[PDB]
Structure formats: C-alpha cells, structure tokens
C-alpha cells in the first residue's frame, strides 16, 4: 500500500532472488563477479548492491553452509565453497538442490557446546527451534531423523548410540571421526559465535537510498 | 512473512539457541 513499505519488499525479494542465484552458481561449480550481479540480478538497484549481496551472503552461510569469499579484489570475483572446509554438502542422490551442510554445522555446533554428547532431546529441542521436527519433512533440510541416524551416520560425521547404562534406552549424539578431521570443536564454536554477533544490516528507507545516489 | 524470510530467521534463532 505504501511507497516505503513496497520497497523494502523490492529489496527484500532481490535478497531471495540474488540468495538463489549464488545457491545456482554453487550448485554450477562457476565463480561469480559483482559484475554479474549487478546485470542480471539487481539491475534496477545497483547502488544498494552492499545490502543485498550482503543479506544474500549471510543467508546462504546460515542456511545452507555455503561461504561466499571474493578471490580477487581488482577483479570483483567471488569463489563458493562450502563452511568451515567440510567436503560434504549433501548435493547427492536426489537432493540436488538444496545443500544440507547448514543444518550439519547447526548439529555440530550444539553437540560441541554440550561438550562430549548431546542427549537425542537436546538435539530435537535444538532443531525444534528452527521448525525442524522428527518424522516430518522439511521443505528446505527434508526430514532430519534420516539425515541424524543414517546420512551423517554413515558420511562418518555423527554418531549414534545408546547411553551406557541406561533404562530404559536412552540415545546420544557425538562427532564421528570425518568431522573431528575436517573441522574442531574450537572452529565451530567460533563459526557459531561470529554469526550470532553479526550487526544485522538495515533495508535503506527510500531517502537514504538517494543518498546513495 | 515470505518463505525464505522465515527460513532466514529460524536459522538465525537456531544460531542463538546454541550461541547461549
């Protein structure tokens, strides 16, 4: 209804679109320049290229684990590879779409914050947070008993046991031995911690986006 | 509101959940 609100919904639908381009040029194995950006994505709002990349970028490490890293400064261009080093992005089989490296970290990172083990109630409450559920299929991760138990099970990334001792069963989750040499404990506790205290960048109101002009 | 923006903020409430 109003000027100011439909632009920030103009910015905010380019964060999405440029979020899924990158997510295409990962997926394609191709760098990308700034450049490119500016033509075929955000055309008509080059000058707000900071905030939109910068939304983008942000969203891609959070959601899907993807770092969006420039290779040379002069030339503008940027490399996309997956967080922290790890070599696995779950682009395989029939999920060629959507990487689940995000959700992997996520599980990582609370597991390491609980130190040895995380409790299997602890993870659910954990995924429970961020809309993921046991049993149910998420539209972006899938669903998430089959990727704890038996994807990141079987790439070595997690393990799943029993308590010793317990009654009756009880299950615990703990670091297999790819992730103990892809990534640490220190480094994804850093990860986690540097994205938590990223400043959110604001949408520019339309005044202070001519300004930028 | 959009699709992707709630993904975006539940990954960002994920974040903080560990992060405390």
């Not at chain 1, 920030?8 to 899924?20: T, Y």
């Not at chain 1, 970290?105 to 961020?130: F, K, Q, R």
């Not at chain 2, 509101?1 to 405390?20: C, T, W």
Request: charged letters at 25%; proline letters at 3%.
């Amino acid at each position: 209804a109003d000027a100011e609100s439909l632009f920030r919904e103009a910015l905010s639908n380019k964060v999405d679109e440029l979020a899924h381009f990158l997510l295409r040029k990962y997926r394609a194995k191709e760098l990308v320049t700034k450049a490119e950006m500016l033509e075929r994505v955000i055309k008509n709002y080059k000058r707000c290229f900071p905030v939109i990349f910068g939304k983008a970028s942000e969203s891609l490490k959070m959601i899907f684990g993807i770092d969006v890293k420039e290779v040379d400064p002069t030339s503008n261009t940027y490399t996309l590879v997956t967080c922290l080093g790890l070599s696995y992005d779950g682009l395989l089989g029939n999920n060629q779409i959507f990487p689940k490296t995000g959700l992997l970290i996520i599980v990582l990172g609370t597991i390491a914050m609980e130190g040895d083990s995380a409790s299997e109630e602890e993870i659910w409450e954990e995924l429970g947070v961020m809309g993921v559920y046991d049993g149910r299929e998420h539209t972006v991760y899938g669903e998430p008993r089959k990727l704890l138990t038996q994807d990141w099970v079987q790439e070595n990334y997690l393990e799943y046991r029993q308590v010793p001792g317990s009654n009756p069963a009880r299950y615990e989750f703990l670091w297999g031995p790819r992730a103990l040499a892809e990534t640490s404990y220190v480094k994804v506790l850093e990860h986690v911690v540097r994205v938590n205290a990223r400043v959110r960048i604001a949408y520019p109101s339309l005044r202070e986006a001519a300004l930028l002009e | 509101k959009s699709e992707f923006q709630l993904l975006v903020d539940q990954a960002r409430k994920g974040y903080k959940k560990i992060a405390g």
